[PDB]
Write a protein that binds this ligand. Structure first.
Ligand code: CDL
Ligand code: CDL
Ligand code: PC7
Ligand code: PC7
Ligand code: PTY
Ligand code: PTY
Ligand code: PTY
Ligand code: PTY
Ligand code: PTY
Ligand code: PTY
Lengths: 111, 52, 155, 536, 47, 438, 58
């Protein structure tokens, strides 16, 4: 009912007309499951069940926006500390409103 | 006309009260116009229109 | 300090002369300069020849600094391994020198956003000394520790 | 000569795990023990040269392992007294475990791969102990972590073993992350990774906390002890190596090598871990679990002693080396009992005719754990308890832990031998070869030598304590042992249940931390990338 | 292989190209009607 | 340099004249010749020339090509990894598309003109639309995603290049120009934001990788993501440093958020290819942040980590492709018992997964150490944030390995001789880089 | 007033409704599974427990 497709000697031929099934690469394929396949389809196509609800908005804002805000605040604090540590004047950052034009320290200058 | 009046009024009133020409004046005028646009609309629209 | 356009074009012509003199004789070490091209330009980018030459000088210097630091570390490790338990007293100087080399190498070209590398806690100790002096003279109470004699093996 | 030991272990790993088809099961039963014997000869030479004769040596294999700008580290090995002592203990225990595995793992399909993993595990432990810079220690720390992941999960068709390995890996990742942060702090402000230049008299608290958090992972302290109990899924030889030396000791070794710890934290965390581990071991009904909780308790004692005095580092290392032998013996004997009885539960053990060597080795290891006077465990434990008197809080908790330790240890000894037979009337047998007898001879030899040679220089130095205070550890141990033999009830069913659930640390993690982790993942993916930002 | 000569030659070529580009970018209106901006140009109209 | 460029132009040329039956053999020989020419370029690159090792111009600013530290490493990586892609692909159409994509990518890395850079990198736009959208195994959605994201980002980059060419008069990197404009910086930045996946512009990558052939996925992860770092080092930091320093808190927020959200998203994945794709997105964040610090430690660390990723991600994608060929499944739930059934595939898989987790004997460890050191040089909190969240990668990798490692399986699905041959160079390169020959 | 808002396909309702009947994995049976939410309870010192466990001579 089965036969060896591969030939090491190099005289490999596909017996497409053989009654016996060739032991080709397809022999080792794993049998799929109707329910697992539908689970895979549902998981990938999860945008269909998306709904804008107050709980969804709350969860999104609290975790994604909340993390982004925390990260920005920490980065701003670290920049302020570094500027104080280095002795540089308050740098003109993008959203910071500073009446100073300092951005890149001069390599020649001694701070 | 009503939406454009709301936008222009809020923009001028904020700029006068703040006293400075700033991005915030436009943002608050837009937000107020979008709030008026979405008075009775379903859930997503109240968030989306003030933003747009 | 202001730079007039006449002076800027004069320096540009001088730079071109320097390039022409360099070009006259072949040099395999052209991009490993031993001396910088001195200038008073507001921005080094204005004179491209000066910018590239000085950048190559800075790279050469930094490579030298890194190798010097490695040498200092080797003498500190040998000194530490020879003395034994007397290492703290006898290896204070070598350690001081090694830490100074580390600071010079790191601080010279730290970058626009990088902080100064406080090898040996010298800056922290200095800050604490100033804070103590101010608190004591003004009669304030300092919430920070007083400066330390030694904070590290050397500095 | 110093390099040879690491070479022998890595060779045995490569040979058994890459060329096992040629060597065979018997070939691994030869090359493993032979290589470990040669490594023992080298470790003994190293110990004599460095520890006894005060000759530290540095071997730099190559320079510029990492050479990015200022950052420069080299692969170098410094054999200092701590390194020599740990190398010797590790190689002695590994040689014994390799001898043990010849008969224990005969019934396992991959005996070649098991031996390979054991030898690579020992090699990475020797790399961690002997490293001269923080990067080499990290290389060893990660290598033991990976070898533990590959050894705890050896039985892949058991969901418990794979979960136990995942647990170990995650906990060790959190710890090595804190260590990496501390190493970055130390490199930035001292200029080097070498321990000689690493010395800092005053360190900011952040570095101390990061160091402690890194150490509490491998040396399973409170909040980070969840993986140790679970690590029982792996084969018995793995448990002996991890618990006795390779894994639990690394945290203590790191704390002792770089004295950046804070007295207030280490004392409280240690005493808490000692008490909790003893209480958890009281409830436990699996033989291998009780010995794990005992390991936790002893680790608590070693961590606690660092706070008491300046010699705490020496006392901790002395306890660590004394503990590795008896604890290894306890695990190997437990494994043999399980193998002979086909049972893991203390209820079904009982008196049965066996080998004199195994029963004696179990009794002597239990006595060392208990604190029987004039034994290696006794001197190393009294050195801690006597010196901890100054810290009133640490001392009281450690004495209570001594009581609980004695109670469970005595209960286990009574249940395994004195108690009548509890297993069924079925044919069970495990015959012991001469290799197992050699393994127990080695463990007993270590235990005997420890008494003659000692564990710390300051072991027998006088602690100026009243006689009643100096001899109290003995009375508490005796009282606990007597109460344990009588198998009396000490706590109400509510507390016995609480202690059986190990304090509910894992129930907290599952109900709250895991749910929060997977809710963050749900918001990050389902709600956002594949919801809001995905087209119809 | 004289690296210094090659570098200077390449830089010079790029600088010449940039100069030629800037000269090329100077373009007045070419409208036939716009006689004022192009007064000096020599043109003949057949109309 | 001239030899490398000539071999690059010959590889697409050779296909036109081959017999149509010798195509695969000729393509493999050409790929090896291009690798050897890259080695020759490395040999003819003297470290004495600190700025640019070699610059060649063929009559115009557009035809200015040159190699620097970043360019040299990326070009060698592309030449090293292309033979593997070639052997994995069958058919003249597939070979033609792959060889054209490779030629365009390899020419982009060495280009020193922004407009020429754009011309060469974006030439391979339809070819990716056609490759990812192939008849049976491709997805039109993924093709549209990648194509639209690339077009929008590259068009913004093009507008910035046009302004720089108008204002300065040249857009060649070799001419020192500085700009403080924020619109132009944003235009150049948006390309980098999209190409190197950074949240929220990372959606195109996973779709493309899943529905691309193994040769395509290997090329994409191996080198296509790296093209961002060449643009940053060569076309962004020299001119728009001021804007990177001005926006550093925002850059850090976006990079750390990308690292966190990508790590969390990797936890919900059930497809092996998607797991590898999201791991790449997480890994790109450290490289981007390290380069943005504009420090020696950061630029070197970013390039080194890029090479380590360009050696570890192709390996995982290759093993995943081999497994899919053997089993026709990428679902972790269907794949069980792989330890017992494929001891040789499993060993290499475990080794590569250990590499992805930045263990010490792997290039990732050294690279991560350098990048973390650069972050610590900026601020201690910056380093701590990245170090702490690295555990999430461990959780997903451990869960995947555990699911694959054990269970009951009735199929022997192990690698053939061809599959071992394809990964052996990657294994050896990983080991060599791991031991410190970076 | 007709507006885009009327004709935009807002995501207010799920396009796909998951199947109600859902697979529950087989699990070993625990006969008595009520959770104990009270650390201190009369059950621990119940007369039955005292007779069955505490009292019998051992
Ligand atoms: C952070 C806080 C939490 C985040 C969100 C929390 C609440 C969000 C509230 C907003 C909301 O509900 O949006 C839903 C709403 C979509 O409606 P829907 O209910 O999902 O279904 C309708 C479709 O039929 C749906 O049909 P569909 O399924 O076929 O379409 C799906 C589509 C629908 O998607 C969209 O239409 C918009 C996608 C991006 C929105 C851009 C920002 C929106 C929120 C940002 C700030 C929120 C704070 C509150 O998604 C996509 O495929 C496109 C995304 C692919 C590109 C990825 C680029 C991402 C950019 C920013 C990501 C958002 C930030 C979160 C991550 C943070 C990372 C920094 O989106 C919008 O309407 C956009 C709102 C703001 C747009 C920006 C301003 C527009 C500028 C116009 C100016 C006018 C010019 C005048 C001239 C005009 C003549 C030309
Ligand atoms: C002097 C001594 C002699 C020494 C030799 C030195 C001479 C130097 C050069 C001479 C070499 C001959 C030139 C070849 C001409 C014909 C080539 C061709 O038809 O391609 C397919 C053809 C394969 O033919 P086939 O398999 O028998 O079936 C085709 C059937 O006719 C129709 O089949 P289908 O309907 O099924 O179509 C399916 C299609 C799937 O559908 C598509 O994908 C359509 C996509 C639209 C175009 C693709 C956009 C992206 C292309 C990027 C360019 C690739 C290079 C990347 C480098 C970046 C350059 C900026 O897939 C393909 O066709 C192949 C996919 C990739 C090939 C696309 C590259 C060809 C670009 C334009 C070809 C030139 C035609 C000029 C016409 C002249 C008079 C009519 O040739 C190839 O072997 C692969 C292409 C070789 C490309 C080299 C051509 C140079 C183009 C690069 C532009 C640079 C400027 C030109 C300067 C060149 C040096 C001065
Ligand atoms: C399918 C596989 C089957 C076959 C398995 C192969 C077995 C491989 C054997 C493992 C090799 C272990 C050796 C590790 C050392 C690496 C050797 C090496 O790199 O050569 C060094 C020379 O150094 C040595 O030879 C080391 C001695 C090796 C053996 C000594 C003891 C052996 C015990 C192993 C412990 C090594 C710990 C090192 C941890 C980093 C090159 O010298 P340099 O000129 O300085 O090179 C520059 C440095 N850098 C690489 C960073 C650019
Ligand atoms: C540092 C200096 C010298 C370095 C030597 C290191 C020691 C040997 C390293 C050899 C290569 C390193 C990684 C080997 C490939 C990783 C795969 C592996 O180790 O094991 C494979 C298979 O193992 C092999 O075939 C090759 C192993 C040969 C030697 C391995 C020694 C232990 C690995 C050392 C850990 C690497 C360190 C990386 C981080 C520091 C999978 O095993 P399991 O998942 O447990 O399943 C096996 C089936 N069963 C369920 C029955 C258990
Ligand atoms: C609709 C979208 C959004 C809606 C929902 C958003 C809700 C989020 C709101 C809170 C989020 C976290 C709080 C951070 C911002 C707090 C207030 C910002 C103002 C501020 O900068 O104060 C600083 C906060 O401390 C700090 O510097 C940061 C402390 C908190 C960071 C750590 C907390 C979590 C850690 C997790 C890792 C995240 C960071 C990783 C690096 C300290 O004041 P100052 O001294 O700087 O003076 C600076 C002058 N105001
Ligand atoms: C393409 C840009 C469109 C913006 C996209 C944002 C997301 C859309 C969501 C809709 C929200 C409405 C738009 C808000 C964006 C503005 C940013 C808010 C920051 C802010 O409030 O500060 C203002 C200045 O920022 C400013 O107003 C200038 C900031 C410029 C906007 C951000 C530029 C890059 C964003 C592109 C990201 C990715 C592109 C894909 C869309 C105040 O300033 P003030 O002077 O009033 O001070 C106060 C003295 N009273
Ligand atoms: C010696 C050093 C100390 C070692 C460990 C000390 C731990 C002490 C912390 C516990 C003591 C205070 C507990 C808070 C008071 C709660 C009193 C009743 C608890 C309660 O009603 O709800 C619980 C909340 O969980 C909780 O109570 C979780 C709060 C715990 C705070 C986090 C501290 C880490 C805890 C790690 C070990 C503790 C294990 C047991 C807590 C169960 O909630 P539910 O699931 O039934 O809700 C239903 C799901 N919708
Ligand atoms: C006997 C046969 C042995 C069989 C196997 C052994 C194979 C080779 C073993 C040793 C050879 C090591 C060379 C590999 C790469 C090292 C490159 C290198 O470190 O030199 C850099 C050259 O610049 C460059 O730009 C070099 C670019 C080319 C390097 C390769 C790029 C990746 C290609 C694919 C990876 C495979 C690598 C193998 C500059 O180094 P430095 O200036 O940073 O200072 C050095 C301290 N770090
Ligand atoms: C002064 C101006 C004021 C502002 C006015 C703005 C007005 C609109 C501006 C929007 C411009 C963005 C262009 C992209 C449009 C979204 C893609 C079209 C959606 C779509 O259905 O495309 C399908 C697949 O696309 C896909 O699969 C692509 C998925 C979404 C692409 C993501 C967009 C790239 C990133 C967006 C911003 C990035 C940085 C921004 C600086 C193909 O549909 P079909 O072929 O079947 O046609 C059948 C007809 N339905
Ligand atoms: C809301 C968070 C911001 C999201 C971006 C996060 C990280 C992006 C950083 C990229 C790094 C370099 C880019 C330079 C600036 C881009 C965004 C910086 C933040 C920003 O919007 O600052 C604005 C100025 O930037 C500008 O005026 C230009 C803004 C970008 C333009 C948007 C689209 C441009 C596309 C043009 C294509 C090519 C054009 C070439 C001619 C207003 O800040 P402010 O200084 O006014 O402070 C007043 C507040 N009180």
């Amino acid at each position: 009912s089965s036969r060896i497709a591969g030939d090491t000697t190099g005289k490999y031929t596909p017996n497409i007309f053989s009654p016996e099934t060739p032991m080709d690469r397809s022999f080792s394929h794993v049998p799929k499951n109707p329910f697992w396949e539908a689970w895979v389809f549902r998981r990938d196509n999860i945008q269909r069940e998306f709904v804008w609800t107050w709980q969804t908005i709350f969860d999104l804002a609290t975790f994604v926006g909340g993390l982004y805000v925390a990260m920005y605040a920490t980065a701003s604090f670290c920049s302020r500390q570094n500027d104080k540590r280095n002795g540089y004047p308050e740098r003109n950052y993008y959203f910071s409103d500073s009446k100073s034009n300092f951005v890149i320290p001069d390599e020649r200058e001694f701070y | 006309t009503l939406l454009g009046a709301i936008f222009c009024a809020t923009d001028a009133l904020y700029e006068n009260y703040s006293g400075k020409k700033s991005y915030t004046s436009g943002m608050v005028a837009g937000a107020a116009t979008g709030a008026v646009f979405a008075i009775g609309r379903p859930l997503p629209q109240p968030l989306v229109w003030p933003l747009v | 300090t202001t730079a007039t356009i006449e002076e800027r074009r004069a320096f540009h012509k001088e730079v071109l002369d320097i390039v022409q003199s360099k070009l006259a004789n072949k040099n395999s070490e052209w991009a490993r300069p031993e001396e910088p091209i001195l200038h008073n330009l507001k921005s080094e980018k204005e004179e491209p020849h000066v910018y590239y030459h000085n950048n190559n000088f800075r790279v050469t210097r930094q490579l030298i600094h890194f190798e010097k630091t490695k040498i200092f570390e080797d003498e500190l490790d040998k000194c530490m391994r020879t003395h034994g338990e007397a290492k703290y007293r006898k290896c204070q100087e070598i350690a001081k020198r090694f830490q100074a080399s580390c600071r010079v190498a790191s601080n010279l070209e730290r970058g626009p956003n990088a902080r100064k590398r406080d090898v040996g806690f010298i800056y922290q100790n200095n800050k604490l000394r100033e804070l103590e002096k101010d608190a004591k003279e003004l009669g304030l109470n300092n919430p920070f520790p007083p400066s330390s004699p030694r904070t590290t093996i050397g500095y | 000569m110093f390099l040879l030991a690491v070479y022998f272990l890595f060779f045995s790993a490569i040979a058994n795990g890459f060329f096992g088809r040629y060597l065979g099961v018997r070939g691994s039963q030869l090359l493993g023990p032979s290589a470990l014997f040669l490594a023992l000869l080298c470790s003994g030479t190293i110990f004599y040269e460095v520890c006894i004769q005060g000759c530290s040596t540095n071997i730099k294999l190559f320079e510029n392992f990492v050479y990015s700008n200022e950052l420069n580290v080299s692969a170098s090995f410094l054999y200092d007294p701590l390194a020599a002592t740990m190398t010797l203990t590790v190689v002695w225990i590994s040689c014994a475990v390799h001898a043990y595995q010849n008969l224990y793992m005969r019934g396992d399909g991959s005996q070649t791969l098991f031996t390979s993993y054991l030898s690579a595990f020992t090699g990475f432990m020797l790399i961690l102990v002997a490293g001269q810079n923080l990067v080499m220690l990290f290389i060893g720390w990660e290598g033991i972590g990976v070898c533990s992941y590959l050894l705890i999960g050896y039985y892949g068709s058991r969901v418990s073993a794979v979960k136990s390995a995942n647990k170990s890996l995650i906990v060790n990742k959190i710890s090595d992350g804190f260590l990496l942060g501390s190493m970055l702090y130390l490199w930035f402000y001292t200029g080097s990774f070498s321990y000689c230049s690493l010395a800092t008299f005053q360190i900011p608290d952040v570095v101390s906390i990061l160091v402690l958090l890194g150490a509490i992972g491998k040396s399973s302290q409170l909040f980070f002890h969840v993986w140790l109990a679970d690590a029982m899924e792996g084969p018995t030889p793995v448990s002996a190596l991890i618990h006795a030396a390779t894994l639990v000791t690394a945290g203590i070794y790191v704390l002792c090598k770089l004295n950046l710890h804070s007295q207030s934290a280490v004392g409280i965390l240690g005493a808490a871990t000692a008490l909790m581990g003893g209480l958890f071991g009281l409830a436990a009904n699996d033989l291998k679990r009780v010995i794990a909780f005992s390991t936790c308790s002893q680790l608590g004692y070693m961590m606690a002693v660092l706070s008491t005095c300046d010699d705490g580092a020496d006392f901790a290392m002395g306890h660590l080396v004394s503990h590795a032998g008896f604890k290894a013996t306890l695990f190997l004997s437990a494994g043999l009992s399980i193998a002979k009885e086909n049972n893991n539960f203390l209820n079904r053990y009982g008196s049965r005719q066996g080998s004199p060597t195994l029963s004696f080795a179990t009794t002597i290891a239990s006595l060392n754990l208990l604190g029987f006077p004039e034994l290696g465990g006794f001197y190393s434990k009294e050195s801690i308890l006597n010196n901890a008197y100054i810290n009133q809080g640490v001392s009281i908790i450690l004495t209570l832990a001594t009581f609980l330790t004695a109670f469970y240890t005595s209960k286990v000894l009574a249940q395994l031998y004195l108690f009548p037979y509890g297993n069924g009337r079925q044919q069970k047998s495990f015959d012991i070869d001469a290799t197992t007898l050699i393994c127990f001879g080695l463990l007993l030899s270590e235990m005997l030598l420890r008494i003659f040679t000692g564990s710390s220089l300051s072991q027998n130095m006088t602690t100026n304590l009243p006689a009643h205070i100096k001899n109290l550890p003995f009375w508490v141990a005796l009282s606990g042992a007597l109460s344990g033999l009588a198998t009396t009830n000490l706590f109400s069913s509510n507390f016995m249940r609480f202690f059986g659930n190990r304090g509910g640390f894992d129930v907290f993690y599952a109900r709250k931390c895991s749910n929060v982790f997977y809710h963050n993942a749900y918001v990050s993916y389902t709600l956002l990338d594949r919801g809001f930002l995905k087209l119809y | 292989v004289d690296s210094q000569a090659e570098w200077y030659a390449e830089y010079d070529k790029l600088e010449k190209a940039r100069q030629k580009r800037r000269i090329w970018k100077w373009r007045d209106s070419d409208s036939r009607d716009e006689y004022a901006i192009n007064a000096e140009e020599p043109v003949i109209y057949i109309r | 340099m001239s030899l490398y460029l000539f071999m690059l132009f010959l590889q697409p040329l050779s296909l036109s004249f081959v017999s149509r039956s010798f195509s695969k053999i000729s393509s493999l020989m050409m790929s090896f010749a291009t690798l050897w020419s890259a080695v020759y370029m490395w040999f003819t690159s003297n470290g004495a020339n600190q700025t640019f090792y070699q610059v060649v111009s063929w009559g115009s600013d557009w035809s200015t090509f040159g190699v620097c530290y970043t360019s040299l490493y990326i070009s060698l990586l592309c030449a090293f990894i292309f033979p593997i892609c070639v052997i994995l692909v069958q058919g003249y159409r597939a070979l033609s598309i792959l060889i054209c994509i490779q030629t365009a990518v390899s020419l982009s890395i060495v280009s020193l003109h922004m407009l020429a850079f754009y011309a060469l990198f974006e030439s391979s736009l339809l070819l990716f639309f056609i490759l990812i959208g192939r008849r049976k195994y491709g997805s039109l959605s993924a093709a549209y995603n990648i194509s639209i994201y690339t077009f929008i980002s590259a068009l913004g980059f093009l507008i910035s290049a046009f302004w720089l060419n108008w204002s300065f008069g040249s857009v060649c990197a070799l001419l020192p120009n500085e700009e403080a404009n924020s619109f132009v910086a944003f235009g150049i930045f948006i390309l980098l934001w999209v190409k190197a996946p950074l949240v929220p512009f990372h959606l195109w990558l996973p779709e493309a990788h899943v529905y691309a052939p193994t040769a395509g996925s290997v090329l994409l992860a191996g080198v296509l993501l790296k093209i961002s770092i060449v643009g940053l080092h060569v076309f962004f930091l020299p001119i728009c440093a001021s804007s990177i320093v001005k926006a550093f808190p925002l850059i850090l927020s976006i990079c750390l958020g990308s690292f966190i959200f990508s790590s969390f998203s990797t936890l919900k994945q059930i497809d092996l290819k998607k797991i590898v794709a999201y791991s790449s997105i997480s890994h790109m964040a450290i490289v981007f942040l390290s380069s943005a610090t504009n420090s020696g430690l950061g630029i070197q660390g970013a390039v080194l980590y890029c090479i380590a990723h360009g050696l570890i991600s192709p390996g995982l994608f290759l093993l995943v492709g081999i497994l899919y060929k053997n089993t026709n499944t990428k679902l972790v739930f269907y794949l069980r018992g792989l330890s017992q059934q494929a001891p040789v595939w499993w060993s290499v898989w475990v080794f590569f997964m250990l590499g992805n987790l930045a263990f010490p004997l792997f290039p990732n460890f050294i690279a991560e150490v350098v990048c973390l050191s650069a972050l610590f040089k900026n601020h201690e909190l910056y380093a701590y944030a990245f170090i702490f969240f690295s555990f999430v990668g461990t959780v997903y990798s451990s869960t995947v390995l555990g699911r694959l490692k054990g269970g009951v399986s009735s199929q022997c699905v192990d690698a053939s001789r061809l599959d071992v041959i394809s990964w052996n160079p990657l294994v050896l390169a990983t080991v060599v880089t791991g031991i410190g020959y970076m | 007033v007709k507006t885009l808002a009327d004709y935009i396909h807002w995501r207010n309702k799920p396009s796909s409704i998951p199947p109600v009947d859902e697979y529950r994995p087989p699990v070993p049976l625990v006969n008595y599974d009520k959770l104990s939410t009270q650390f201190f309870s009369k059950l621990d010192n119940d007369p039955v427990i005292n007779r069955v466990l505490r009292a019998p001579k051992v």
